[PDB]
Design an enzyme around this catalytic site. Structure first.
Site, short mmCIF file in Angstrom:
data_model
loop_
_atom_site.label_atom_id
_atom_site.label_comp_id
_atom_site.label_asym_id
_atom_site.label_seq_id
_atom_site.Cartn_x
_atom_site.Cartn_y
_atom_site.Cartn_z
NE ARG A 13 -2.78 1.24 3.45
CZ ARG A 13 -3.59 1.22 4.50
NH1 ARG A 13 -4.84 0.79 4.36
NH2 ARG A 13 -3.16 1.63 5.69
NE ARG A 21 2.74 3.57 -6.88
CZ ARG A 21 2.29 4.64 -6.23
NH1 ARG A 21 2.18 4.61 -4.91
NH2 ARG A 21 1.96 5.73 -6.90
N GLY A 120 -0.17 17.85 17.46
CA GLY A 120 -0.61 16.96 16.40
C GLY A 120 -1.28 15.70 16.90
CG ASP A 219 8.99 13.15 8.01
OD1 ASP A 219 8.83 12.45 6.99
OD2 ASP A 219 8.17 13.15 8.96
CE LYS A 221 6.77 18.29 6.97
NZ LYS A 221 5.40 17.88 6.58
CG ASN A 224 9.32 18.29 10.23
OD1 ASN A 224 8.34 18.62 10.90
ND2 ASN A 224 9.31 17.24 9.41
C1 LIG Z 1 1.01 10.47 5.83
C2 LIG Z 1 1.50 9.27 5.02
C3 LIG Z 1 2.38 8.27 5.78
O1 LIG Z 1 2.66 8.44 6.96
N1 LIG Z 1 2.79 7.22 5.04
C4 LIG Z 1 3.56 6.30 5.62
C5 LIG Z 1 4.85 6.59 6.07
C6 LIG Z 1 5.61 5.60 6.68
N2 LIG Z 1 6.85 5.83 7.12
C7 LIG Z 1 7.09 6.86 7.95
O2 LIG Z 1 6.21 7.62 8.35
N3 LIG Z 1 8.36 7.03 8.35
C8 LIG Z 1 8.77 8.12 9.23
C9 LIG Z 1 9.54 9.13 8.40
C10 LIG Z 1 10.02 10.26 9.29
N4 LIG Z 1 10.90 9.75 10.35
C11 LIG Z 1 11.35 10.90 11.16
C12 LIG Z 1 12.41 10.57 12.00
C13 LIG Z 1 12.38 11.00 13.32
C14 LIG Z 1 13.43 10.68 14.18
C15 LIG Z 1 14.52 9.95 13.72
C16 LIG Z 1 15.57 9.62 14.57
N5 LIG Z 1 15.87 8.31 14.66
C17 LIG Z 1 16.85 7.84 15.45
C18 LIG Z 1 17.13 6.48 15.50
C19 LIG Z 1 18.14 6.01 16.33
N6 LIG Z 1 18.85 6.84 17.08
C20 LIG Z 1 18.60 8.22 17.05
O3 LIG Z 1 19.27 8.97 17.75
C21 LIG Z 1 17.59 8.72 16.23
C22 LIG Z 1 17.31 10.07 16.18
C23 LIG Z 1 16.29 10.54 15.35
C24 LIG Z 1 16.07 11.92 15.35
C25 LIG Z 1 15.89 12.58 16.55
C26 LIG Z 1 15.68 13.95 16.58
C27 LIG Z 1 15.67 14.68 15.40
C28 LIG Z 1 15.86 14.03 14.18
C29 LIG Z 1 16.07 12.65 14.16
C30 LIG Z 1 14.54 9.51 12.40
C31 LIG Z 1 13.49 9.83 11.54
C32 LIG Z 1 10.15 8.79 11.19
C33 LIG Z 1 9.66 7.61 10.36
C34 LIG Z 1 5.09 4.32 6.80
C35 LIG Z 1 3.80 4.03 6.35
C36 LIG Z 1 3.04 5.03 5.75
CL1 LIG Z 1 1.45 4.67 5.19
#
Ligand SMILES: *CCC(=O)Nc1cc(NC(=O)NC2CCN(Cc3ccc(-c4nc5cc[nH]c(=O)c5cc4-c4ccccc4)cc3)CC2)ccc1Cl
Length: 386
Positions: A13, A21, A120, A219, A221, A224
């Site tokens: 999906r 898809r 949100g 993400d 943009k 953010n």
């Molecule tokens: C509306 C349609 C929809 O949602 N479709 C859809 C999307 C998805 N997949 C997602 O939504 N994926 C998200 C993309 C954005 N991403 C943001 C994000 C936040 C935080 C981190 C992050 N990760 C880690 C991991 C390990 N250690 C760490 O220190 C960090 C730190 C951070 C981080 C912290 C603070 C600021 C920035 C980054 C990474 C990415 C979240 C997943 C799936 C299905 C569907 Cl339908």
């Protein structure tokens, strides 16, 4: 030692357009579960596609023979929905995925904060702006449903983590220097020097997430991005996965910042964030989005097909950077190579920039937000309307 456990065609999906898809997925013993538009002929694995610490669910809605991979990535719950033709195939996939996941497995309370504002709402919880009563600091609290379930200067830090009887709570540090879209809107356009500063800090943070954390932010943009009290960039983690809104089709959010490979629900990697970097830095220096229109079909075509154009007031260095960052093919995109961020740090637009000084915040912020401290509430007042 890394090998394919199971591969075959699946119905995925779409992540932003809700249509189904046909994708060829590869399940590997390192935990990666990646789908492709076409079967690849074929280095560090990205945790975005990892099935480690995930739960599998079998559903008959909205389509029979559907299975869902629900994962908690950092502080965000995501769901990957798939469909097969026969129940037998679903059991084969779910068993294989679960087997891989198994093989890889080898006080602060709510009364301590004051509710301020809803940031949100998501499918599996909500995000709330809170203020700790003791310190007066500002925080974003992610309150996730319980049953469905690291420091960098330019990333919003996870401060606390606690849980209630039915909720899991993540406490993010909340910048009080104001939203970056508010600043850009007020000053119309940033100078190349100022955009270089914000851009440099973003690159540093993206470099950290890619090499150290092996994850794609995806993400990136304007919405953010925030500034702290000193005027340094903070990349936010306040997001939650929502269900799309019903132009008769169903779309989830706005596509203006999405990378082309992400829109087409194809294989994506670190190059996605560099596209986001291009979009952000384009708007800072040009004063508008790179691709903009009302029709989602039109907007998609502009992103997928229309070449990016630049103002006459833009310098060749900036044009070179933006052109590289906004290449529609991620394999040809600036920073899309094996060198990743180094491909961008060595670009002539960032000439003279000492990247060790960037990480250590030795660079003087060209703009100082009108706040006295981290508790100043100026960018939370009525002025935000102006
Ligand atoms: C509306 C349609 C929809 O949602 N479709 C859809 C999307 C998805 N997949 C997602 O939504 N994926 C998200 C993309 C954005 N991403 C943001 C994000 C936040 C935080 C981190 C992050 N990760 C880690 C991991 C390990 N250690 C760490 O220190 C960090 C730190 C951070 C981080 C912290 C603070 C600021 C920035 C980054 C990474 C990415 C979240 C997943 C799936 C299905 C569907 Cl339908």
């Amino acid at each position: 030692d890394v090998a394919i456990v199971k591969e075959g065609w699946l119905h995925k999906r779409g992540e932003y357009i809700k249509t189904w898809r046909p994708r060829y997925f590869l399940l590997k013993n390192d935990g990666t579960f990646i789908g492709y538009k076409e079967r690849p002929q074929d280095e560090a694995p990205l945790n975005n596609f990892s099935v480690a610490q995930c739960q599998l669910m079998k559903t008959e809605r909205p389509r029979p023979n559907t299975f869902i991979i629900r994962c908690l990535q950092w502080t965000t719950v995501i769901e990957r929905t798939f469909h097969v033709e026969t129940p037998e195939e679903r059991e084969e996939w779910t068993t294989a995925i679960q087997t891989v996941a198994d093989g890889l497995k080898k006080r602060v309370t709510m009364n301590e904060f004051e509710y301020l504002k809803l940031l949100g709402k998501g499918t599996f919880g909500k995000v709330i702006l809170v203020k700790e009563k003791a310190t007066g600091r500002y925080y974003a609290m992610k309150i996730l449903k319980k049953e469905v379930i690291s420091r960098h200067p330019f990333l919003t830090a996870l401060k606390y983590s606690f849980q209630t009887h039915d909720r899991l709570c993540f406490v993010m540090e909340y910048a009080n220097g104001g939203e970056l879209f508010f600043h850009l809107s007020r000053e119309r356009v940033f100078s190349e020097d100022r955009a270089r500063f914000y851009g440099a800090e973003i690159v540093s943070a993206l470099d950290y997430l890619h090499s150290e954390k092996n994850v794609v932010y995806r993400d990136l943009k304007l919405e953010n991005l925030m500034l702290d009290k000193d005027g340094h960039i903070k990349i936010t983690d306040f997001g939650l996965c929502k269900e799309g809104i019903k132009t008769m089709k169903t779309f989830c959010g706005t596509p203006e910042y999405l990378a082309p490979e992400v829109l087409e629900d194809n294989d994506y990697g670190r190059a996605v964030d560099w596209w986001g970097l291009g979009v952000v830095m384009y708007e800072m220096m040009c004063g508008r989005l790179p691709f903009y229109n009302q029709d989602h079909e039109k907007l998609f075509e502009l992103i997928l097909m229309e070449e990016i154009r630049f103002p006459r007031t833009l310098g060749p260095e900036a044009k070179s950077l933006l052109s590289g960052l906004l290449k529609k093919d991620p394999k040809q995109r600036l920073g899309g190579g094996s060198e990743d961020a180094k491909e961008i740090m060595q670009h002539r637009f960032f000439a003279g920039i000492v990247w060790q000084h960037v990480y250590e915040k030795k660079l003087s912020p060209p703009f100082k937000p009108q706040v006295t401290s981290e508790t100043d509430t100026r960018y939370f007042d009525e002025e935000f309307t102006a």
